[PDB]
């Protein structure tokens, strides 16, 4: 029933994941098809 | 550490507007192409664009002569409004990912490019070198995530925010046309950065806050002092309807409250219908007036009133996405007060990319 | 006084963009005669004439906000203007959905969060018509 | 629910034409009604 390390680590990992998804999508030089 | 231009730290009125109406708050940081009434471009017809490459290299050679005449160190050049033209210097472009950021720089303000480079475990060759900015080795990631070993990330760093930027080459078809009253001018661009989600370092105040009303009062006082400095009359005197032209949403009781101390109204005789400066009042020096209001406080106030307009036009989820809430949430998360739900509705993308800065316990 | 400069982006067809780029990087005033811009009183229509060849232009609104940043030492950058408009050469039509950079494509449709409840101006016109009237009758309706 | 408005006006010379106008835009609706409800309380 963690109320301390579980919440903190979960928030931290979601933060690294979003930071790393944004870096990749933004630096992509891949052409994107007009929709 | 950030040194803005002398038009920016003196809060001069083209660059830092005193009043923004509703149609000017909807077009906040998106200024439309205005039609001129007088000038060379005001006459209808075809207009030749003018190349400016002798102007660029003449100005750069002149600034290098100024720098080598002053001992060769690093110099401060942006001292006039005519230094802030696009006609000279090395221009880059900076595109924003979010539609309406929580904070945004006014014209004339400075920012730095910092290249954060986490070394590889043990031996590393050195930071991949980059054309713009200075490199710094970051063990502790500035942003929410953490840098990989051997990963260099460039970022805009100033007093307002800190945001990851990504250098892209320009399209092969796009040029930059600087139009003024006299004619069109064309530059090419080669470097364009994409600015990610901002990490706010300044807290936008809320509407009717104490910090909000304090900034409004201090801005009006600074404008009144600078009108008194501009007065040529030996007893310095100003007119009330100059201030009413600058701040037309203000009730005149507040303007008279600011003029009550430091001025008095002359009805008859000489200086009639003028607000002369009191003889015992020492008008503050330039550095005291600069210490009264900061330009970043003006940017935070402009963000607040623009978000006020957008929320007002669109009739609690939207209120959470207001920059006073999101800036308070992010700065509180950086002190370790609270955590943020990184997936939510304050997400400026509207998809899984990007963060949401709203407080969670 | 000082008036903030108004910078916009000009997008040309690729062969005409190559000729304009070569003439810009050359640097003579010969380019001045070759490249002209005529903006129509619509405000969103124009001709760009490259080498006296007319091209049809539209001034469109860009979904993101760009900012020109000048520098003298390539370490500190000063914001010079805000760019929000592009004169592409070849209302809903005057709004551009894509951004200039490659990662920003279909930004307005996909990477922009949309919050919703011209329309205000229409409501003002309706209020003016109600004022110029004598008797006003209103009912929220159903299918009819 | 859509919004329909009936307007009574006087034409040049002598006339009393009535115009019934229906607003199907729910955005125009909201902004329209909010002023009346405000002006109804503004008395």
Curated annotation (Swiss-Prot), chain C:
Phosphorylated by CIITA. Its main location: nucleus. It comes from the Eukaryota. GO terms for biological process: chromatin organization; DNA-templated transcription initiation; estrogen receptor signaling pathway; mRNA transcription by RNA polymerase II; negative regulation of DNA-templated transcription; negative regulation of MHC class I biosynthetic process; negative regulation of MHC class II biosynthetic process; negative regulation of protein kinase activity. The modification Phosphoserine is found at residue 128. Belongs to the TAF7 family. The TFIID basal transcription factor complex plays a major role in the initiation of RNA polymerase II (Pol II)-dependent transcription. TFIID recognizes and binds promoters with or without a TATA box via its subunit TBP, a TATA-box-binding protein, and promotes assembly of the pre-initiation complex (PIC). The TFIID complex consists of TBP and TBP-associated factors (TAFs), including TAF1, TAF2, TAF3, TAF4, TAF5, TAF6, TAF7, TAF8, TAF9, TAF10, TAF11, TAF12 and TAF13. TAF7 forms a promoter DNA binding subcomplex of TFIID, together with TAF1 and TAF2. This is Transcription initiation factor TFIID subunit 7. The chain holds residues 9 to 187 of 349 of the full protein.
Curated annotation (Swiss-Prot), chain D:
It is found in: Nucleus. Changing residue 7 to C: Found in a patient with X-linked intellectual disability; uncertain significance. Phosphorylated by casein kinase II in vitro. It comes from the Eukaryota. The TFIID basal transcription factor complex plays a major role in the initiation of RNA polymerase II (Pol II)-dependent transcription. TFIID recognizes and binds promoters with or without a TATA box via its subunit TBP, a TATA-box-binding protein, and promotes assembly of the pre-initiation complex (PIC). The TFIID complex consists of TBP and TBP-associated factors (TAFs), including TAF1, TAF2, TAF3, TAF4, TAF5, TAF6, TAF7, TAF8, TAF9, TAF10, TAF11, TAF12 and TAF13. TAF1 is the largest component and core scaffold of the TFIID complex, involved in nucleating complex assembly. Belongs to the TAF1 family. It is linked to Dystonia 3, torsion, X-linked: An X-linked dystonia-parkinsonism disorder. Dystonia is defined by the presence of sustained involuntary muscle contractions, often leading to abnormal postures. DYT3 is characterized by severe progressive torsion dystonia followed by parkinsonism. It has a well-defined pathology of extensive neuronal loss and mosaic gliosis in the striatum (caudate nucleus and putamen) which appears to resemble that in Huntington disease. Component of the TFIID basal transcription factor complex, composed of TATA-box-binding protein TBP, and a number of TBP-associated factors (TAFs), including TAF1, TAF2, TAF3, TAF4, TAF5, TAF6, TAF7, TAF8, TAF9, TAF10, TAF11, TAF12 and TAF13. Interacts with TAF7; the interaction is direct. TAF1, when part of the TFIID complex, interacts with C-terminus of TP53. The Bromo domain mediates interaction with histones that have acetylated lysine residues at specific positions. The second domain also recognizes and binds histones that are butyrylated and crotonylated. This is Transcription initiation factor TFIID subunit 1. The lineage of its organism: Eukaryota, Metazoa, Chordata, Craniata, Vertebrata.
